[PDB]
Symmetry: D2
Subunit: 114 residues, 4 copies
């Protein structure tokens, strides 16, 4: 199934944060309404925060995460969880290799903010 | 129900990262084996990262998050999610006031690393 | 935090299913727009499906689960999880006693149907 | 990413329940020890329970769900959620066609029981 695609409420601020756990340099692109709105790159095997930013979901609410290593797309896994009917997390893992730890870039989207 | 308590695999490194969304300064304590292992603090209404660290779950694997604001413990909400049977998120929201957004301190624990 | 309350799409069918795991007879109430729409009951320590029903979420979409045992409300835990941005589960556990297994009545709400 | 595969605690009883929402007849296989341990089959567009059972996760704890329609394997989506560090849900959706509702067979695994 499609992964890394989330529908947020329109015109809503959200956080996006990326972590790296791989020998390869991760590139994370975050698209809002099919246009890149944030980009983070870096290498870590210690869960470095390679980027964290506040974005706006815009009129469409369409948010997509893409992960690649030197242009090669990683395979994605994702889900969303809502706590107390109010607090939202959109979660992404990605795999750049063969071990299927799916932590090579980890992306967390959270809303609402403020 | 108890919230903010998670059983990780023993002796396993994990990431812990906290975000703030409130007027009030958030103090986040992370306990491993019922001892404080990390403390983060800061203030933001824009989802700033107020701390991030790698810890070890230790022999018992017991990890607990607590949050205090303006002299009182915040009410917590939490869950754990596992993607593709490999990638683990332990998620915490917290409420320091009356609006029940539960985002006042948000804490993300993720494992495995590396 | 409040538990067992979910905002579903308005006017939409959903499934609700309850499982029992306790020496005590469970009573599960499902409220749509604050009025009882289904009630299930039974006594099992082996996950009996004491009820399953298709309901409509009505004009407001508000769905609430409550659980009682020997006329006493059980403590609830809950969350919602969304797979591939389309498939929704609202999950409830409940505790009638002292062991904190939270499985005494388990309720799963799923949508969309058809 | 692989879907429908879950690691349960070893030698632990768990519930498995399947629902149908499709014109096609669903066949749900549940594997423990990498061998089929239960099979459910039925057809409904109204979320009917097509089977429920209690199984033992065996020495490895590995549980797998597979779904087909008239011999054609359905595409799966899955995740595991843990509430209050105690109550586990392993959730599966499946798609047999083109609409990507992923509800054509829905499978809920829950543990612990009792
Ligand atoms: C150090 C290794 O780097 C890449 O091979 C990753 O795919 C592995 O998961 C591991 O992080
Ligand atoms: C700015 C406000 O600060 C505190 O009152 C928080 O509890 C509110 O959620 C909001 O973030
Ligand atoms: C048999 C026991 O019955 C009640 O005490 C439940 O609260 C326990 O969880 C257990 O199911
Ligand atoms: C009635 C329809 O039957 C199959 O085409 C399913 O894939 C659809 O989701 C729908 O349930
Ligand atoms: Ca990897
Ligand atoms: Ca890795
Ligand atoms: Ca608040
Ligand atoms: Ca807030
Ligand atoms: Ca109990
Ligand atoms: Ca019980
Ligand atoms: Ca379908
Ligand atoms: Ca369907």
């Amino acid at each position: 199934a499609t992964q890394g695609v989330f529908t947020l409420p329109a015109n809503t601020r959200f956080g996006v944060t990326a972590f790296a756990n791989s020998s390869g340099t991760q590139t994370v692109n975050v698209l809002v309404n099919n246009e890149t709105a944030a980009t983070f790159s870096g290498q870590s095997t210690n869960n470095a925060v390679i980027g964290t930013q506040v974005l706006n979901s815009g009129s469409s609410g369409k948010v997509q995460v893409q992960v690649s290593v030197n242009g090669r797309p990683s395979d994605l896994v994702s889900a969303q969880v809502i706590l107390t009917n109010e607090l939202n997390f959109a979660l992404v893992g990605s795999e750049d290799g063969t071990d299927n730890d799916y932590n090579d870039a980890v992306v967390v989207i959270n809303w609402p903010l403020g």
